């Protein structure tokens, strides 16, 4: 073979050339945190949550877009890696709104969960927050852009998998806004899957909105019958009533997407 040896916390692993730091850590079961990286989108590298120390190197590197070189020891649990995670989570929660009780993403939020796992437990932010004008992209996705953390999974999904090219960032700096820039109604055949990949409650499901809450739902694994693809789904229910339909990972059918009729 041509596998190069790298190290994750001293443990040797044999990876292909071109494998990043994040996948090399995934091969030993360690999951580096992330917000903008998604394994089916293109690599963006623009949330800096995956910053990890390579030892004998005086700079943390973005693990989603850094290919490993032969001989690196990836320190996934060292001190400056955890300081990088706490700092980036502090900046992510600097302008994020206190909407967790009124947010549908609460209980299933990536920002909540890895703020618990990797963030600081309190705030140093003594200022006022930004408030972003909400957009209207159709009757399926509820858009509350104050909750956006600008990870650009919107744009990569609509540009690459949905093939639409109608989401993007207008503005510059802290005033940068993911949106459509006009009252344009983002209605693809795969327009609901951005509810899946949005790590925050900026894009939620408008028919599902306010009705249920993910800890109380029972998850039953089932099959789509709306089309002849055979998409694996999870029907999540609550007290004998169907609440929503989510995809399942099947690498040969629907990789982790479903059509809008299914959803």
């Amino acid at each position: 073979s041509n596998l190069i040896e790298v190290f994750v916390d001293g443990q040797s692993v044999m990876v292909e050339p071109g494998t990043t730091v994040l996948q090399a850590c995934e091969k030993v079961g360690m999951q580096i945190p992330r917000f903008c990286y998604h394994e089916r989108l293109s690599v963006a590298g623009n949330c800096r949550m995956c910053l990890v120390e390579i030892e004998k190197a005086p700079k943390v590197v973005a693990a989603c877009a850094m290919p490993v070189m032969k001989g690196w020891n990836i320190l996934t649990n060292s001190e400056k890696t955890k300081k990088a995670r706490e700092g980036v989570m502090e900046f992510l929660l600097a302008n994020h709104p206190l909407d967790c009780p009124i947010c549908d993403q609460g209980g299933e939020c990536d920002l909540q969960d890895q703020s618990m796992m990797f963030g600081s437990d309190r705030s140093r932010f003594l200022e006022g927050k930004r408030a972003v004008e909400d957009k209207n992209i159709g009757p399926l996705v509820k858009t509350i852009m104050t909750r956006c953390i600008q990870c650009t999974r919107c744009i990569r999904f609509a540009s690459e998998i949905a093939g639409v090219d109608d989401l993007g960032t207008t503005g510059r700096g802290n005033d940068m806004q993911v949106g459509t820039y006009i009252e344009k109604m983002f209605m693809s055949e795969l327009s609901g899957n951005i509810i899946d990949i949005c790590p925050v409650g900026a894009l939620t499901s408008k028919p599902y909105a306010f009705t249920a809450r993910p800890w109380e739902t029972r998850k039953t694994e089932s099959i789509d019958v709306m089309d002849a693809v055979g998409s694996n789904i999870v029907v999540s229910t609550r007290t004998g009533e169907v609440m929503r339909i989510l995809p399942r990972m099947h690498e040969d059918i629907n990789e982790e997407w479903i059509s809008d009729k299914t959803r």
Binding site: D99, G128, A131
Partner: protein, 95 residues
Amino acid sequence: GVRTSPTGEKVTHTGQVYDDEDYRRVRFVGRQKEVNENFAIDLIAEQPVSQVGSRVISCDGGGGALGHPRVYINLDKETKTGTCGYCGLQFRQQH
């Protein structure tokens, strides 16, 4: 702002009222259906839209720590008021 079904049974703030042919009205026979007569959707429509001179307003529901979590509302739309998501109060930039 309560209303009443043709059965005489009062309609709640949800809109719930039993049907005419539903047996479960027998629990109110000889007793009363307890509804609240202060509908919050009617009481929040009586509040004035607060005219402010900023682009972003904040709301904490009044009282400080006695209200809700403090949220910031963007007021860039002159077409529409910016409603607080917790308390239902609504704001407008005055220009």
